From a paper:
The ALDH1A3-ATP structure at 1.78-Å resolution contains one ATP molecule in each subunit. The ATP molecule in monomers A and B is located in the adenosine-binding moiety of the cofactor-binding pocket and is accommodated via direct hydrogen bonding with Thr178, Trp180, Lys204, Glu207, and Ser258, and via hydrophobic interactions with ten additional residues (right). The α- and β-phosphate groups of ATP have identical interactions to those of the NAD+ pyrophosphate, including four water molecules, while the γ-phosphate group is not showing any specific interaction. As anticipated, the average B-factor increased from α- to γ-phosphate groups of ATP (66–72 Å2), being highest for the latter, indicating more flexibility at this end of the ATP molecule. The ALDH1A3-ATP structure also contains two PEG molecules (PEG1 and PEG2) inside the substrate-binding pocket in monomers A and B. However, in this case, the PEG1 molecule is covalently bound to Cy314 in both subunits with a distance between Sγ-Cys314 and C1-PEG1 atoms of 1.82 and 1.83 Å for monomers A and B, respectively, which is a typical distance for a covalent C − S bond. The O1-PEG1 atom is hydrogen bonded to the N-Cys314 and Nδ2-Asn181 atoms in both monomers and occupies the position of the water molecule near Cys314 in the ALDH1A3-NAD+ structure. The genuine interest of the ALDH1A3-ATP structure is that it can be interpreted as a true thioacyl-enzyme intermediate in the ALDH catalytic mechanism, which is trapped in a dead enzyme lacking an active cofactor. The role of Asn181 in stabilizing the reaction intermediate through hydrogen bonding with the O atom of the carbonyl substrate, as suggested by our results, is consistent with similar bonds observed in other ALDH ternary complexes. At physiological concentrations, ATP inhibits the dehydrogenase activity of ALDH1A3 and other isoforms, with a Ki value of 0.48 mM for ALDH1A3, showing a mixed inhibition type against NAD+.
Author numbering:
A (entry chain B), B (entry chain A), C (entry chain B), D (entry chain A): 20 to 508
Write the structure that this text describes.
Amino acid sequence: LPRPIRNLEVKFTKIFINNEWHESKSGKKFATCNPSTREQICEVEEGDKPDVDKAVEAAQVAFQRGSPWRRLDALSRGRLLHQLADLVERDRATLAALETMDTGKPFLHAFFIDLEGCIRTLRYFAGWADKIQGKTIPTDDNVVCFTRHEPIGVCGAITPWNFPLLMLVWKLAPALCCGNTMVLKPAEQTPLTALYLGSLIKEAGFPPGVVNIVPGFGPTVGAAISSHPQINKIAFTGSTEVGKLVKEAASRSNLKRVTLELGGKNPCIVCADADLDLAVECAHQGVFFNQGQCCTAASRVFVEEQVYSEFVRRSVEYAKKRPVGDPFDVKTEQGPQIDQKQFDKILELIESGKKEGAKLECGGSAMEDKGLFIKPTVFSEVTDNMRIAKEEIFGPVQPILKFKSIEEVIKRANSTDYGLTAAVFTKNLDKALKLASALESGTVWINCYNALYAQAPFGGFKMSGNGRELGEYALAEYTEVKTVTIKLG
Amino acid sequence: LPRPIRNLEVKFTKIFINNEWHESKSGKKFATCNPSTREQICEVEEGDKPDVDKAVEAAQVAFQRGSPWRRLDALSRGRLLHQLADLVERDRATLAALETMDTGKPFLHAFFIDLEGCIRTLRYFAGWADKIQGKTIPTDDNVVCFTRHEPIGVCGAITPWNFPLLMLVWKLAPALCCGNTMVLKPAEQTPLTALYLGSLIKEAGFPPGVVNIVPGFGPTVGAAISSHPQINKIAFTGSTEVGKLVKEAASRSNLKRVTLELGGKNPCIVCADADLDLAVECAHQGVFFNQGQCCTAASRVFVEEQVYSEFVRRSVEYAKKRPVGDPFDVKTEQGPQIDQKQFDKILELIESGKKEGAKLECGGSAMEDKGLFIKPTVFSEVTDNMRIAKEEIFGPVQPILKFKSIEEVIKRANSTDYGLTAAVFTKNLDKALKLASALESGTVWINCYNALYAQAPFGGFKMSGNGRELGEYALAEYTEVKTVTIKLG
Amino acid sequence: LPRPIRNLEVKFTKIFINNEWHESKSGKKFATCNPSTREQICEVEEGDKPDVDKAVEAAQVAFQRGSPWRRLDALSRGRLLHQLADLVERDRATLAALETMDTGKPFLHAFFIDLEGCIRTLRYFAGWADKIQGKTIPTDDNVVCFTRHEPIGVCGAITPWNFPLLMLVWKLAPALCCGNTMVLKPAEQTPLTALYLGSLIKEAGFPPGVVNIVPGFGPTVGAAISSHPQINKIAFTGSTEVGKLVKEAASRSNLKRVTLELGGKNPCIVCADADLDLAVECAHQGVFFNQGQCCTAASRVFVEEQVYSEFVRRSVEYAKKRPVGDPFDVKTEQGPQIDQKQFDKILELIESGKKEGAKLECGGSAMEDKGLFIKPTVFSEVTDNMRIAKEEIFGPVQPILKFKSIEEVIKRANSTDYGLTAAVFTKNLDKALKLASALESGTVWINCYNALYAQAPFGGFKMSGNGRELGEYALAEYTEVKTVTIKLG
Amino acid sequence: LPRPIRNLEVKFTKIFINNEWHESKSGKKFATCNPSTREQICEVEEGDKPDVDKAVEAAQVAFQRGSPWRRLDALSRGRLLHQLADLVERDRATLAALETMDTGKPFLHAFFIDLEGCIRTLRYFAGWADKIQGKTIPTDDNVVCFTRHEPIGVCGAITPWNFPLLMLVWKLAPALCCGNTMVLKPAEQTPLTALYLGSLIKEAGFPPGVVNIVPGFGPTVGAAISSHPQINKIAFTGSTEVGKLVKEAASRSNLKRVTLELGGKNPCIVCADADLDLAVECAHQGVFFNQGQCCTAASRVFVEEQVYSEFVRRSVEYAKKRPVGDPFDVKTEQGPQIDQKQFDKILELIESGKKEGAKLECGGSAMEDKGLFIKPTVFSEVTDNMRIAKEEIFGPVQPILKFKSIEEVIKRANSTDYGLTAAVFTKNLDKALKLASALESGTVWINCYNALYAQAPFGGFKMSGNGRELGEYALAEYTEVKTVTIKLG
Ligand SMILES: Nc1ncnc2c1ncn2[C@@H]1O[C@H](COP(=O)(O)OP(=O)(O)OP(=O)(O)O)[C@@H](O)[C@H]1O
Ligand SMILES: Nc1ncnc2c1ncn2[C@@H]1O[C@H](COP(=O)(O)OP(=O)(O)OP(=O)(O)O)[C@@H](O)[C@H]1O
């Protein structure tokens, strides 16, 4: 196991433009606080519209025809991404420590999950660089028709506080592999790993202006990016409400392309013939992973009547044994919630459960009267009309609903405006495939949960998003199709 | 040559929902007028939000799991699209006549261009129905991962007045081949071919509710479609201003997927080494086709200084010899403009060209005093700052500009916020490919103009659009990607 | 049900070259006899090397640059195949009757299985004609690299007696859709449907020389095709021994490309958790379909010990009720075997079973002392070392073997030099996917048998063949890849 | 520039099986000689059929289900290929020196051409490992159909003496990225780089038996590989005569899949409108690269009559100035021929050119009386009937032929039984694309020569080969397609 870095000094705190560090144009700065201790970590330069303008102009110059970035052969863009992955691997412990300090997630989770995801995603897209292929299309005997899959141009990337570096890398890896330039805006709560990544981008050898990073607030920096007349594409991960604002501003300004990865009301369907211990363990990790602060979180655990009582019993047992505490301690599986507004929202939803008729099986309150920790909570006798079964909790709360038939559970699982993920637990071939086909979700897991691969696309149906991240499908978000039609005389 | 149907009676004027004809819920009707005779053709039912709600509910019921449309095998949807193409070919004369009546385009142009495009597009996408393939993705030894390219659901289609049936078919053909259901809104100026197509959809055997058609106005029917919470995707063709409103309405409502095909400020570049007579004939058809009312119309004809004078001279001969008159006459190459608003807009721009310093080479005024016909107009000595060079004329006006170097003409051609099409005329291999690569346009034609194929994608860069129509690329706009990841125990 | 044509006169009996009918160069003729009655049907022209030379020269002329076939646009080759499918549909009863007379298979099987397969295959490949796309490959900033998927040229097609027309159409549909020309050789036992198809090819409008048909014997016509210096590709379906000779002659002569579809020793694995009645019915159809004369025939039925005795009992019941008799009679499910050498081989293998220790559960002898009919036979207590479990019977004999574990049955099923098809019967998700992954077979059916689709590739692993027929994969057998690399100055 | 290793000691001379070094079962050894010094370099173990049987059994054990190689995830095979590329780059100087010692090619050519190709090919295919994707195919509402692109199994690789390491890497890179295991046979003249690569395969961490190397002769080791019943695929590069023997042996034995990369009679067409100096430099490197010992060598330089005399004149200057000598010297562009047999064959053809009427413009004899060096030779007035135009010289002889029209030169260029490469020099767009389409060659270069990319497929039409090497196309040669069709109950 890697040794934790409990007292790490943050070195990178400025705006990154043209491979140089800059103070904000206004001189303003903002603080980032450690959610575990509640103390201030450091001050970071606070960007605004003039800093975004400078970042966009640097990205435009780096993207113009004839530039060192545009002239690189396809395989050299791949080599640059591999070198970046090598540096992320070399500085893996430092990056994980910065993520633990900023988010409160356990150091070993940031090391083995977030950083592993970053490295695998960078290596995967490094391999696509010389494999982005268009088509030659048969038309007429005297015509030569083909398509080019060109880079779009300047890509904005706006990311959230729950998986800061990973959500950034999910955008940067396909964007750079396709030949685009970028302006990145990490969440104001979590700017540290993004700024450290900027130092690795320069050391890896990327030409200046290819990647630019402007820390700051959503309505200031984020809105300057979404409305920018010279940004050609935006990729956003965060709340559905902010995703709607970003896409509206993009449409109002220059019709820039927009990919959105938003929330979900994700179901977890446990059939009577499931491997019950596997279903209990996966639905537990599904609800409680990252303190329940994950877009993939299970928010509705539907269990067939035949195994309902036993499933609740084993779930209550798992929830009570989960070690909650200091993220740097090796034993910890659950750190604190990110902030007060998030924490208070969870407790208000927990209170709503008892009042509406759900049976509080365990937890249901804070761990201590000072910290941001909530005790792993489980509710049984949950019905569809309840608040704990309709609203995204984003916390450690497991609502367990009962069902009788497959046709019934398909209708109930799909009765939401969302569709990010779904999970099915059954040993039966036909039920597994029938449910995988019928569930309106971007990812359907069978007999597993949170099984992500850099080669498998991820994204939402309905209000859970537009477009896909990961896999070959990610390339379509970062390229523009040009048809060239030549008529021979 | 097919005989012109100069006195065709209109049979279909109602709202089409569940394969039945309905009056508008309000009882209101609007008139459609013939731009050649300036007389009313008929009254069509005027839809509003209640009619759109009824059409959407029919489309949702036809898309629900277990419906006859959803249970058809892949090859059977192809058979349906092929039968629809056979009916369009059988009724080709009636449809071309209805299109000439509504738009003023020559009958032979509607017959051999619009209708040929319709038939070819339907047959091409009929062939894709059993060829929409997802992927099997290698992950780990104990994992089976694959993608399904599922239909999106209810698709809205909002089309313009210049190529009414063709723009509708460009959306209907891939939508139905992918298994979606639809709500169509033809332009208020041109509803007749859309309603006749509804009668053919029923005759072809499409289950009720698979295609629904609601004639009416933009802020009423169109806005109800763009904002509907049960429409999952919208495809729009029309102006950049309205495309922005449609996309903002989509974002604000349910984040429905949006394809936009908008205007352009399309360059036509003629090099000194070009086959001059070929370039003259192509740039002439490129400006004057469909009375200049084309999204692909060349808005700036850039001609190299060495051949400028001769290009201008031959272009004037073509414009002066272009036959303008009754669209039902075999000799007619240019009919009237769509309406008085369009006609006055074109004359205002012609007047503006004279006032800003361009040399009026021919035309420059209306053909008569009581019609909507405009004399084919050519302007030389045009500069980039002029209104006739900066604005989309959407009329029979050819602005001819002069250039000296390739690098200069690339900068000038790309200086726009648009990027729909571009055309290049040169005999030099390196020059043709360098321009094909450097021009920021969705389609680049070389030694041809308006060369479209059902198998070649079409769409814009920048503010000319989002997404593609035609080719294999159209399928991505009408399907939603689902990852299924199975962990073997 | 279609009315049978018991006394149909065969109209087409000559060599088909350049859309004209010719007598053989030698004047020689051969007879085709009805295997049901044992009487002569008619005489057919007997081709040899000079008739193959004339057919190849006609195919070469039809393939040369500038020819009417080479100049057709991609979509028109698709239209021609659709018209051919329409004619095959129009003359479906006549074609099925010719196939029943030649092969002895029931009229309703030829009508609803063989002819349905022909029509679906022609329609499917008609849709690929304008969708055969190469690639544009990113290399260097100053390079334009792309691939063309060109037709190969003259394609020979050699087919067997068990599914005469279907095996021919599996080759002709992708060959013509890709733009190739052809020389067809049907089996000497079954030339009638191929010659009738020649009349439909001319009526459909294919240019002369695009398809040429030379009936005759294997060592004469077949060997002239396989060794021909001007045939560029051969596709063969038949025995492994003859497939080896064809590929050797192809390599010795001009290295012409060769696709082979050969025999198999196909296993059918029934797990204890299977739907037993479904497994019994599918393994019954799997063994006894087309009188056991099918490359897909189940030759080893492995049944798990827990359900072994019950599976044997229900199988014996199904075998005893199968109606054997006149192919034109509506009730008949099993006609006669094709010929004496085939029939005697079956009886010799049946005799070997009793002698080696297998338990003859039912049948085991001829139906009558005059005809070519064999009684549906089932053997239990079959072991791997036995002749009935190692050699391809090509008859109505069901060897039932017992197994205890999945790992054991994988090893035993894969212990053959063949690998055409496999079938698995289980309700368990994990076993179904583990077996589908581990079985070395070109097609793995789960809970079904003989489930073929024009869109799903079919072909063998190991000595069961080289290449694939059907699906998008079929196009790779009928195209040659050309890389065009252009360096810009 | 890298320092030449003029006295490198050979470390690896043994048979490589299961990551260990073995003596030949017979104890026999054969000598490898340096063509520059004409002295023995060392003795290498001489394999035979027993060594091939041992290597095949090791490869089969390493490919068996559950082996460490088979259980590695897709991305881990990519990591292994990348590590192998890093070791080849680290030992680049040693490998280039070993290649110069065995072949006589200049050290800098081996370093910047052969070794660069090796590294680029390994890195390209390392990127394909987790991107080999099958398809999900739409069939019926109750069917789940998909394809898997499985590894074929044990792959044999038989390579020639002209580009020893590069031809081996062209097979190894896609074979291993697809998950296959291998048995390699380098040419008897050039075994040293293959055995050094074996030491790097072990160092990189490939499990034992994944790559096995057996040096030896063709009719002994090569024939044992081509006829082996447990080798599932063979890839061969070399002469057309031997490729035929290999393919016939494959057919006769177990129908193992065969890729062939054979000789060519490659045309180089220079039009009157070409950049003459570019065409002279390209056709010179195209004939003289690697002492003329290239499968891509231009065998007929067709020059348009209008520029014929000037082309001949400038070509002679290039040939007379080409530095011939010690390959370890920085200035050397042409080393010795491979052996006495090759050297005498070239001189016999040079003598034949003089006797048949060609004008000897320069060279025409050996450089000295004791070496294997030949003076760069140019012949003008060459006609199609001559031996120097009809036969593959495989030496430094440039035959320059004259042509008048495009149609004439297309007929003459395609009159061969071969079709590996073609090159065209013209500034005209239509001429370049018409020739690219009409020339029957696997690769058509336009305004360049020998422009190869790891991402661009390479192979022949007609008797120049079967299948492709490089690009995505190479994956199809190293995978076997499996259709899995699941019927839901
Ligand atoms: N108006 C905006 N325009 C653009 N970006 C914004 C805007 N508002 C927020 N963002 C940015 O979007 C990203 C995601 O923020 P997010 O939607 O998750 O808000 P949140 O505070 O985390 O959620 P919540 O308010 O539901 O608790 C961050 O980088 C944030 O700064
Ligand atoms: N030597 C040959 N060369 C080429 N084609 C041949 C040759 N021998 C047979 N054929 C042809 O190949 C096709 C398939 O014949 P096939 O291999 O099935 O022989 P068969 O008589 O049916 O089998 P079996 O001898 O095992 O009972 C037929 O069209 C046949 O005429």
